[PDB]
Structure 1
Protein backbone atom coordinates (compact mmCIF):
# COMPACT_ATOMS: atom_id res chain seq x y z
CA UNK A 1 0.00 0.00 0.00
CA UNK A 2 1.32 3.42 -1.01
CA UNK A 3 0.79 6.79 0.68
CA UNK A 4 2.15 9.34 -1.80
CA UNK A 5 0.68 11.79 -4.32
CA UNK A 6 -0.35 9.22 -6.92
CA UNK A 7 -3.82 8.09 -5.84
CA UNK A 8 -5.77 9.30 -8.89
CA UNK A 9 -3.19 7.41 -10.96
CA UNK A 10 -3.28 4.00 -9.27
CA UNK A 11 -7.06 4.41 -9.27
CA UNK A 12 -7.59 4.37 -13.03
CA UNK A 13 -5.20 1.41 -13.12
CA UNK A 14 -7.35 -0.94 -11.07
CA UNK A 15 -10.42 0.26 -12.95
CA UNK A 16 -8.77 -0.70 -16.24
CA UNK A 17 -8.44 -4.36 -15.26
CA UNK A 18 -11.97 -4.33 -13.86
CA UNK A 19 -13.93 -3.35 -16.96
CA UNK A 20 -11.57 -5.64 -18.87
CA UNK A 21 -12.49 -8.76 -16.89
CA UNK A 22 -16.13 -8.16 -17.84
CA UNK A 23 -15.18 -8.16 -21.52
CA UNK A 24 -13.96 -11.73 -21.07
CA UNK A 25 -17.30 -12.67 -19.51
CA UNK A 26 -19.17 -11.33 -22.55
CA UNK A 27 -18.94 -14.91 -23.89
CA UNK A 28 -22.17 -15.34 -21.97
CA UNK A 29 -23.79 -13.52 -19.00
CA UNK A 30 -26.40 -15.99 -17.74
CA UNK A 31 -28.62 -13.91 -15.49
CA UNK A 32 -28.01 -10.47 -16.98
CA UNK A 33 -28.98 -9.52 -20.60
CA UNK A 34 -26.61 -7.64 -22.93
CA UNK A 35 -27.98 -4.20 -21.92
CA UNK A 36 -26.62 -4.95 -18.44
CA UNK A 37 -23.14 -5.94 -19.57
CA UNK A 38 -23.19 -2.69 -21.50
CA UNK A 39 -23.90 -0.93 -18.22
CA UNK A 40 -20.42 -2.03 -17.13
CA UNK A 41 -18.64 -0.59 -20.15
CA UNK A 42 -20.78 2.44 -19.43
CA UNK A 43 -19.74 3.13 -15.83
CA UNK A 44 -16.64 0.86 -15.19
CA UNK A 45 -14.88 2.41 -18.23
CA UNK A 46 -15.99 6.04 -17.86
CA UNK A 47 -15.07 6.15 -14.18
CA UNK A 48 -11.62 4.79 -14.96
CA UNK A 49 -10.41 7.47 -17.39
CA UNK A 50 -11.96 10.07 -15.07
CA UNK A 51 -9.53 9.48 -12.20
CA UNK A 52 -6.57 9.43 -14.61
CA UNK A 53 -7.44 13.06 -15.30
CA UNK A 54 -7.38 14.07 -11.65
CA UNK A 55 -3.76 12.87 -11.71
CA UNK A 56 -2.75 15.09 -14.64
CA UNK A 57 -4.26 18.05 -12.75
CA UNK A 58 -7.11 18.48 -15.23
CA UNK A 59 -10.48 18.66 -13.51
CA UNK A 60 -10.64 21.21 -10.70
CA UNK A 61 -10.39 24.92 -11.49
CA UNK A 62 -10.17 28.04 -9.32
CA UNK A 63 -13.53 29.82 -9.34
CA UNK A 64 -14.18 32.88 -7.17
CA UNK A 65 -10.92 32.69 -5.24
CA UNK A 66 -11.96 29.17 -4.27
CA UNK A 67 -11.40 25.57 -5.35
CA UNK A 68 -14.34 23.86 -7.05
CA UNK A 69 -14.53 20.07 -7.37
CA UNK A 70 -16.09 19.95 -10.83
CA UNK A 71 -14.30 16.83 -12.07
CA UNK A 72 -15.31 15.22 -8.78
CA UNK A 73 -19.04 15.64 -9.38
CA UNK A 74 -19.28 14.72 -13.08
CA UNK A 75 -17.33 11.54 -12.44
CA UNK A 76 -19.52 11.03 -9.38
CA UNK A 77 -22.50 11.19 -11.71
CA UNK A 78 -21.88 8.42 -14.19
CA UNK A 79 -20.26 6.65 -11.26
CA UNK A 80 -22.86 7.25 -8.53
CA UNK A 81 -26.08 7.44 -10.68
CA UNK A 82 -25.03 4.22 -12.54
CA UNK A 83 -23.78 2.58 -9.32
CA UNK A 84 -27.23 2.20 -7.80
CA UNK A 85 -28.76 1.52 -11.22
CA UNK A 86 -26.12 -1.17 -11.74
CA UNK A 87 -27.31 -3.06 -8.67
CA UNK A 88 -30.85 -3.19 -10.03
CA UNK A 89 -29.69 -3.89 -13.58
CA UNK A 90 -27.59 -6.86 -12.48
CA UNK A 91 -30.62 -8.30 -10.71
CA UNK A 92 -32.94 -7.63 -13.65
CA UNK A 93 -33.54 -10.85 -15.60
CA UNK A 94 -35.36 -9.66 -18.72
CA UNK A 95 -37.11 -6.56 -20.06
CA UNK A 96 -40.09 -5.68 -22.25
CA UNK A 97 -41.34 -2.34 -20.93
CA UNK A 98 -40.39 0.87 -19.09
CA UNK A 99 -42.85 0.94 -16.19
CA UNK A 100 -43.98 4.21 -14.61
CA UNK A 101 -43.33 3.28 -10.97
CA UNK A 102 -39.65 2.47 -11.43
CA UNK A 103 -39.31 5.07 -14.17
CA UNK A 104 -40.18 7.83 -11.71
CA UNK A 105 -37.78 6.50 -9.08
CA UNK A 106 -34.83 6.39 -11.48
CA UNK A 107 -35.59 10.04 -12.25
CA UNK A 108 -35.44 10.88 -8.54
CA UNK A 109 -31.82 9.90 -7.91
CA UNK A 110 -30.94 11.44 -11.27
CA UNK A 111 -32.04 14.88 -10.05
CA UNK A 112 -30.41 14.50 -6.63
CA UNK A 113 -26.88 13.92 -7.90
CA UNK A 114 -27.47 16.72 -10.40
CA UNK A 115 -27.89 19.01 -7.41
CA UNK A 116 -24.46 17.86 -6.32
CA UNK A 117 -22.66 19.42 -9.28
CA UNK A 118 -24.45 22.71 -8.62
CA UNK A 119 -23.56 22.51 -4.92
CA UNK A 120 -19.95 22.99 -6.01
CA UNK A 121 -20.85 25.40 -8.82
CA UNK A 122 -22.96 27.46 -6.41
CA UNK A 123 -23.04 31.26 -6.48
CA UNK A 124 -23.56 31.95 -2.77
CA UNK A 125 -23.10 30.27 0.61
CA UNK A 126 -26.71 30.35 1.80
CA UNK A 127 -27.51 28.34 -1.33
CA UNK A 128 -24.74 25.82 -0.65
CA UNK A 129 -26.14 24.60 2.67
CA UNK A 130 -29.64 24.79 1.21
CA UNK A 131 -28.77 22.65 -1.81
CA UNK A 132 -26.78 20.17 0.27
CA UNK A 133 -29.92 19.35 2.24
CA UNK A 134 -31.85 19.09 -1.03
CA UNK A 135 -29.87 16.01 -2.02
CA UNK A 136 -29.76 14.08 1.25
CA UNK A 137 -33.51 14.64 1.64
CA UNK A 138 -34.55 13.18 -1.72
CA UNK A 139 -32.01 10.41 -1.09
CA UNK A 140 -33.54 8.83 2.01
CA UNK A 141 -36.85 9.07 0.15
CA UNK A 142 -35.50 6.99 -2.74
CA UNK A 143 -34.18 4.02 -0.76
CA UNK A 144 -37.45 3.87 1.17
CA UNK A 145 -39.28 4.17 -2.15
CA UNK A 146 -37.77 1.00 -3.61
CA UNK A 147 -38.40 -1.36 -0.68
CA UNK A 148 -41.71 0.26 0.28
CA UNK A 149 -43.81 -0.77 -2.78
CA UNK A 150 -42.28 -4.13 -3.71
CA UNK A 151 -44.66 -4.63 -6.64
CA UNK A 152 -45.47 -8.14 -7.85
CA UNK A 153 -42.84 -7.57 -10.56
CA UNK A 154 -40.16 -8.77 -8.13
CA UNK A 155 -42.34 -10.79 -5.76
CA UNK A 156 -43.37 -12.83 -8.80
CA UNK A 157 -40.11 -12.81 -10.77
CA UNK A 158 -38.12 -14.84 -8.25
CA UNK A 159 -38.27 -14.88 -4.45
CA UNK A 160 -34.62 -15.94 -4.42
CA UNK A 161 -33.54 -12.79 -6.25
CA UNK A 162 -35.84 -10.78 -3.99
CA UNK A 163 -34.09 -12.04 -0.86
CA UNK A 164 -30.46 -11.66 -1.92
CA UNK A 165 -31.50 -8.32 -3.40
CA UNK A 166 -32.58 -6.97 -0.01
CA UNK A 167 -29.11 -7.72 1.36
CA UNK A 168 -27.65 -5.97 -1.68
CA UNK A 169 -29.50 -2.66 -1.36
CA UNK A 170 -28.48 -2.80 2.30
CA UNK A 171 -24.76 -3.06 1.60
CA UNK A 172 -24.97 -0.29 -1.00
CA UNK A 173 -26.90 1.85 1.46
CA UNK A 174 -23.87 1.59 3.74
CA UNK A 175 -21.58 2.97 1.03
CA UNK A 176 -23.59 6.19 1.13
CA UNK A 177 -23.43 6.22 4.93
CA UNK A 178 -19.73 6.48 4.24
CA UNK A 179 -19.93 9.61 2.08
CA UNK A 180 -23.21 11.37 3.21
CA UNK A 181 -21.79 11.11 6.78
CA UNK A 182 -18.25 12.43 6.20
CA UNK A 183 -19.74 15.20 4.06
CA UNK A 184 -21.72 16.73 6.92
CA UNK A 185 -19.06 16.97 9.63
CA UNK A 186 -15.83 18.68 8.64
CA UNK A 187 -15.10 20.08 5.15
CA UNK A 188 -15.87 17.10 2.92
CA UNK A 189 -14.07 14.85 5.37
CA UNK A 190 -13.59 14.03 9.05
CA UNK A 191 -12.61 17.56 10.05
CA UNK A 192 -9.75 20.03 9.72
CA UNK A 193 -8.89 18.15 6.52
CA UNK A 194 -6.76 19.77 3.82
CA UNK A 195 -7.17 19.64 0.04
CA UNK A 196 -4.86 16.66 -0.45
CA UNK A 197 -5.80 14.63 2.63
CA UNK A 198 -9.43 15.21 1.63
CA UNK A 199 -9.17 13.65 -1.83
CA UNK A 200 -7.37 10.79 -0.08
CA UNK A 201 -10.22 9.83 2.25
CA UNK A 202 -12.34 9.59 -0.90
CA UNK A 203 -9.93 7.93 -3.37
CA UNK A 204 -9.72 5.18 -0.79
CA UNK A 205 -13.50 5.20 -0.41
CA UNK A 206 -14.85 5.04 -4.06
CA UNK A 207 -12.05 2.55 -4.71
CA UNK A 208 -13.42 0.39 -1.89
CA UNK A 209 -16.99 0.79 -3.16
CA UNK A 210 -16.53 -0.16 -6.81
CA UNK A 211 -14.31 -3.11 -5.92
CA UNK A 212 -16.61 -4.42 -3.21
CA UNK A 213 -19.99 -3.91 -4.88
CA UNK A 214 -18.39 -5.46 -7.97
CA UNK A 215 -17.91 -8.93 -6.49
CA UNK A 216 -21.14 -8.41 -4.53
CA UNK A 217 -23.35 -7.85 -7.58
CA UNK A 218 -22.14 -11.01 -9.31
CA UNK A 219 -21.97 -13.01 -6.07
CA UNK A 220 -25.57 -12.14 -5.29
CA UNK A 221 -27.06 -13.31 -8.58
CA UNK A 222 -25.09 -16.56 -8.41
CA UNK A 223 -22.21 -17.45 -6.10
CA UNK A 224 -22.33 -21.24 -5.79
CA UNK A 225 -24.76 -24.15 -6.10
CA UNK A 226 -25.37 -26.05 -2.86
CA UNK A 227 -28.66 -27.89 -3.31
CA UNK A 228 -28.05 -31.39 -4.67
CA UNK A 229 -26.27 -32.88 -1.65
Structure 2
Protein backbone atom coordinates (compact mmCIF):
# COMPACT_ATOMS: atom_id res chain seq x y z
CA UNK A 1 0.00 0.00 0.00
CA UNK A 2 1.52 3.28 -1.21
CA UNK A 3 0.68 6.78 0.02
CA UNK A 4 -2.08 7.44 -2.54
CA UNK A 5 -3.88 4.22 -1.63
CA UNK A 6 -3.57 5.09 2.06
CA UNK A 7 -4.95 8.59 1.51
CA UNK A 8 -7.89 7.14 -0.44
CA UNK A 9 -8.62 4.57 2.32
CA UNK A 10 -8.64 7.32 4.95
CA UNK A 11 -10.99 9.29 2.71
CA UNK A 12 -13.24 6.22 2.47
CA UNK A 13 -13.22 6.00 6.27
CA UNK A 14 -14.22 9.65 6.47
CA UNK A 15 -17.11 9.17 4.03
CA UNK A 16 -18.29 6.12 5.99
CA UNK A 17 -18.35 7.94 9.31
CA UNK A 18 -20.12 10.86 7.66
CA UNK A 19 -22.74 8.61 6.08
CA UNK A 20 -23.36 6.75 9.35
CA UNK A 21 -23.81 10.08 11.15
CA UNK A 22 -26.39 11.43 8.68
CA UNK A 23 -28.19 8.08 8.87
CA UNK A 24 -28.32 8.38 12.66
CA UNK A 25 -29.63 11.96 12.43
CA UNK A 26 -32.39 10.82 10.07
CA UNK A 27 -33.73 8.53 12.81
CA UNK A 28 -34.46 11.66 14.89
CA UNK A 29 -35.30 14.15 12.03
CA UNK A 30 -36.07 17.15 14.23
CA UNK A 31 -38.17 18.83 11.53
CA UNK A 32 -36.02 17.95 8.51
CA UNK A 33 -37.62 15.89 5.70
CA UNK A 34 -36.18 12.47 4.90
CA UNK A 35 -35.30 13.33 1.30
CA UNK A 36 -32.71 15.83 2.53
CA UNK A 37 -31.22 13.15 4.80
CA UNK A 38 -31.21 10.54 2.01
CA UNK A 39 -29.27 12.75 -0.38
CA UNK A 40 -26.88 13.67 2.42
CA UNK A 41 -26.28 9.94 2.92
CA UNK A 42 -26.00 9.01 -0.77
CA UNK A 43 -23.32 11.60 -1.57
CA UNK A 44 -20.58 10.25 0.74
CA UNK A 45 -21.54 6.66 -0.11
CA UNK A 46 -21.16 7.25 -3.86
CA UNK A 47 -17.92 9.18 -3.30
CA UNK A 48 -16.58 6.56 -0.90
CA UNK A 49 -17.27 3.78 -3.40
CA UNK A 50 -15.49 5.74 -6.12
CA UNK A 51 -12.45 6.33 -3.89
CA UNK A 52 -12.49 2.71 -2.72
CA UNK A 53 -12.15 1.73 -6.37
CA UNK A 54 -9.08 3.97 -6.69
CA UNK A 55 -7.60 2.81 -3.38
CA UNK A 56 -7.81 -0.83 -4.49
CA UNK A 57 -6.52 -0.27 -8.04
CA UNK A 58 -5.88 9.37 -17.36
CA UNK A 59 -5.18 9.01 -13.64
CA UNK A 60 -7.95 9.00 -11.03
CA UNK A 61 -10.65 8.56 -13.68
CA UNK A 62 -13.21 7.48 -11.03
CA UNK A 63 -12.89 10.88 -9.36
CA UNK A 64 -14.77 12.38 -12.31
CA UNK A 65 -17.43 9.65 -12.03
CA UNK A 66 -17.83 10.66 -8.39
CA UNK A 67 -18.29 14.37 -9.24
CA UNK A 68 -20.71 13.58 -12.07
CA UNK A 69 -23.22 12.49 -9.43
CA UNK A 70 -22.20 14.19 -6.20
CA UNK A 71 -21.86 17.78 -7.41
CA UNK A 72 -25.38 18.01 -8.84
CA UNK A 73 -26.67 16.29 -5.69
CA UNK A 74 -24.87 18.83 -3.49
CA UNK A 75 -26.61 21.57 -5.47
CA UNK A 76 -29.91 19.73 -4.99
CA UNK A 77 -29.27 19.70 -1.24
CA UNK A 78 -28.27 23.38 -1.24
CA UNK A 79 -31.39 24.23 -3.29
CA UNK A 80 -33.75 22.40 -0.93
CA UNK A 81 -32.33 24.36 2.00
CA UNK A 82 -32.82 27.66 0.16
CA UNK A 83 -36.46 26.67 -0.38
CA UNK A 84 -36.87 24.86 2.93
CA UNK A 85 -40.26 26.31 3.84
CA UNK A 86 -41.72 26.89 0.38
CA UNK A 87 -42.63 25.07 -2.82
CA UNK A 88 -39.62 23.55 -4.59
CA UNK A 89 -38.75 25.32 -7.83
CA UNK A 90 -37.76 22.20 -9.76
CA UNK A 91 -36.92 24.08 -12.95
CA UNK A 92 -34.28 26.13 -11.09
CA UNK A 93 -32.96 22.96 -9.44
CA UNK A 94 -32.68 21.20 -12.81
CA UNK A 95 -30.91 24.17 -14.34
CA UNK A 96 -28.30 24.20 -11.58
CA UNK A 97 -27.84 20.43 -11.63
CA UNK A 98 -27.45 20.13 -15.42
CA UNK A 99 -25.19 23.16 -15.61
CA UNK A 100 -22.92 21.63 -12.92
CA UNK A 101 -22.75 18.40 -14.89
CA UNK A 102 -21.45 20.47 -17.80
CA UNK A 103 -18.69 21.70 -15.49
CA UNK A 104 -17.58 18.15 -14.76
CA UNK A 105 -17.87 16.86 -18.33
CA UNK A 106 -15.90 19.89 -19.57
CA UNK A 107 -13.24 19.08 -16.98
CA UNK A 108 -12.98 15.45 -18.06
CA UNK A 109 -12.78 16.29 -21.76
CA UNK A 110 -10.05 18.80 -20.97
CA UNK A 111 -8.11 16.12 -19.07
CA UNK A 112 -8.66 13.72 -21.98
CA UNK A 113 -7.42 16.28 -24.50
CA UNK A 114 -4.07 15.69 -26.22
CA UNK A 115 -3.50 19.27 -27.39
CA UNK A 116 -2.76 21.89 -24.72
CA UNK A 117 -4.74 24.71 -26.34
CA UNK A 118 -7.73 22.37 -26.61
CA UNK A 119 -7.28 21.18 -23.02
CA UNK A 120 -7.29 24.74 -21.72
CA UNK A 121 -10.24 25.88 -23.84
CA UNK A 122 -12.35 23.11 -22.29
CA UNK A 123 -11.01 24.11 -18.88
CA UNK A 124 -12.21 27.64 -19.61
CA UNK A 125 -15.57 26.26 -20.73
CA UNK A 126 -15.89 24.48 -17.39
CA UNK A 127 -14.98 27.62 -15.45
CA UNK A 128 -17.65 29.55 -17.35
CA UNK A 129 -20.30 26.96 -16.49
CA UNK A 130 -19.00 27.08 -12.92
CA UNK A 131 -19.40 30.87 -12.85
CA UNK A 132 -23.01 30.39 -13.95
CA UNK A 133 -23.41 28.05 -11.00
CA UNK A 134 -21.97 30.61 -8.58
CA UNK A 135 -24.24 33.27 -10.06
CA UNK A 136 -27.20 30.95 -9.56
CA UNK A 137 -26.63 30.10 -5.90
CA UNK A 138 -25.91 33.76 -5.07
CA UNK A 139 -28.86 35.33 -6.86
CA UNK A 140 -31.97 33.36 -7.90
CA UNK A 141 -31.41 30.70 -5.24
CA UNK A 142 -30.42 33.24 -2.59
CA UNK A 143 -33.47 35.38 -3.44
CA UNK A 144 -35.72 32.44 -2.53
CA UNK A 145 -34.61 32.72 1.11
CA UNK A 146 -35.53 36.40 1.23
CA UNK A 147 -39.18 35.39 0.77
CA UNK A 148 -38.82 33.41 4.01
CA UNK A 149 -37.69 34.00 7.60
CA UNK A 150 -34.50 35.93 8.30
CA UNK A 151 -33.37 32.89 10.29
CA UNK A 152 -33.36 30.74 7.13
CA UNK A 153 -31.80 33.55 5.09
CA UNK A 154 -28.93 33.90 7.58
CA UNK A 155 -28.32 30.13 7.63
CA UNK A 156 -28.30 29.95 3.85
CA UNK A 157 -25.78 32.81 3.59
CA UNK A 158 -23.30 30.99 5.81
CA UNK A 159 -23.78 27.71 3.94
CA UNK A 160 -23.52 29.20 0.45
CA UNK A 161 -20.36 31.03 1.56
CA UNK A 162 -18.82 27.79 2.81
CA UNK A 163 -20.11 26.11 -0.35
CA UNK A 164 -18.52 28.72 -2.67
CA UNK A 165 -15.12 28.81 -0.98
CA UNK A 166 -14.60 25.05 -1.27
CA UNK A 167 -15.92 24.76 -4.82
CA UNK A 168 -13.52 27.46 -6.00
CA UNK A 169 -10.65 25.30 -4.77
CA UNK A 170 -11.37 22.49 -7.26
CA UNK A 171 -10.51 24.35 -10.48
CA UNK A 172 -7.47 25.75 -8.66
CA UNK A 173 -6.02 22.38 -7.62
CA UNK A 174 -6.81 21.01 -11.09
CA UNK A 175 -4.88 23.76 -12.91
CA UNK A 176 -1.84 23.74 -10.61
CA UNK A 177 -1.60 19.96 -10.65
CA UNK A 178 -0.56 17.44 -13.39
CA UNK A 179 -3.71 18.09 -15.43
CA UNK A 180 -2.62 21.72 -15.67
CA UNK A 181 0.69 23.52 -15.17
CA UNK A 182 2.10 20.71 -13.05
CA UNK A 183 3.33 22.88 -10.17
CA UNK A 184 2.52 20.01 -7.82
CA UNK A 185 3.07 16.28 -8.25
CA UNK A 186 0.33 13.65 -8.43
CA UNK A 187 0.68 12.70 -4.77
CA UNK A 188 0.17 16.24 -3.50
CA UNK A 189 -2.63 16.61 -6.05
CA UNK A 190 -4.26 13.46 -4.65
CA UNK A 191 -3.88 14.68 -1.08
CA UNK A 192 -5.67 17.94 -1.91
CA UNK A 193 -8.40 16.06 -3.77
CA UNK A 194 -9.08 14.10 -0.56
CA UNK A 195 -9.28 17.05 1.85
CA UNK A 196 -11.42 19.35 -0.30
CA UNK A 197 -13.96 16.62 -1.14
CA UNK A 198 -14.19 15.62 2.52
CA UNK A 199 -15.16 19.13 3.57
CA UNK A 200 -17.36 19.61 0.50
CA UNK A 201 -19.32 16.41 1.00
CA UNK A 202 -19.37 15.42 4.65
CA UNK A 203 -18.41 18.88 5.89
CA UNK A 204 -21.11 20.74 3.97
CA UNK A 205 -23.89 18.28 4.80
CA UNK A 206 -22.89 18.31 8.47
CA UNK A 207 -23.33 22.10 8.61
CA UNK A 208 -26.44 21.94 6.45
CA UNK A 209 -28.29 19.24 8.40
CA UNK A 210 -27.26 20.46 11.85
CA UNK A 211 -28.05 24.03 10.80
CA UNK A 212 -31.58 23.08 9.74
CA UNK A 213 -32.16 21.00 12.86
CA UNK A 214 -30.90 23.77 15.17
CA UNK A 215 -33.41 26.28 13.81
CA UNK A 216 -35.95 24.13 15.65
CA UNK A 217 -34.39 24.30 19.13
Q: Shorter chain as normaliser: what TM range?
A: 0.7 to 0.9
Answer whether contact 1:90 1:218 (CA < 8 A) is retained.
no
Deviation at 1:11, TM superposition (A): 1.3
Gaps of 5+ in 1: 58-66
Residues 1:149 and 1:83: Cα distance change in structure 2 (over 3 Å): closer
Instruction: For CA contacts below 8 A with separation 6 or more, give which structure has more relative contact order.
Output: 2
Aligned length: 217
| Among candidates 85, 89, 97, match of residue 106 of structure 1 | 97
Deviation at 1:119, TM superposition (A): 2.2
Secondary structure of the residue that 2:85 maps to in structure 1? coil
Deviations 1:39-66 (A, max 9, x none): 1232121111211111111xxxxxxxxx
Answer whether contact 1:33 1:94 (CA < 8 A) is retained.
no
**Higher share of residues assigned helix:** 2
Which stretch shifts more, 141-150 or 189-198?
A: 189-198
TM-score, length-scaled by structure 1: 0.79
Deviation at 1:5, TM superposition (A): 4.9
Residues 1:92 and 1:122: Cα distance change in structure 2 (over 3 Å): same
* 2:50 alignment counterpart: 50
Deviations 1:77-103 (A, max 9, x none): 223222233223345436755543443
Secondary structure of the residue that 1:179 maps to in structure 2? helix
Taking the aligned partners of 2:46 and 2:213, their CA distance within structure 1 comes to 26
Deviations 1:198-229 (A, max 9, x none): 21222233223334323311232243778xxx
Deviations 1:85-141 (A, max 9, x none): 322334543675554344323322222222222222335433211100001112112
| Among candidates 54, 60, 77, match of residue 86 of structure 1 | 77
Residues 1:30 and 1:114: Cα distance change in structure 2 (over 3 Å): farther
Secondary structure of the residue that 1:192 maps to in structure 2? coil
Taking the aligned partners of 1:190 and 1:29, their CA distance within structure 2 comes to 46
Could you say what the CA RMSD is over the residues aligned between the two structures, in angstroms?
Answer: 3.1
Taking the aligned partners of 2:187 and 2:52, their CA distance within structure 1 comes to 16
Taking the aligned partners of 2:85 and 2:102, their CA distance within structure 1 comes to 26
Residues 1:52 and 1:138: Cα distance change in structure 2 (over 3 Å): same
Structure 1 runs (4+) greater than 6 angstroms displaced? 1-4
Residues 1:88 and 1:96: Cα distance change in structure 2 (over 3 Å): closer
Deviation at 1:16, TM superposition (A): 1.2
Taking the aligned partners of 2:154 and 2:137, their CA distance within structure 1 comes to 14
Deviation at 1:173, TM superposition (A): 0.6
Secondary structure of the residue that 1:198 maps to in structure 2? helix
Answer whether contact 1:8 1:51 (CA < 8 A) is retained.
yes
Answer whether contact 1:11 1:51 (CA < 8 A) is retained.
yes
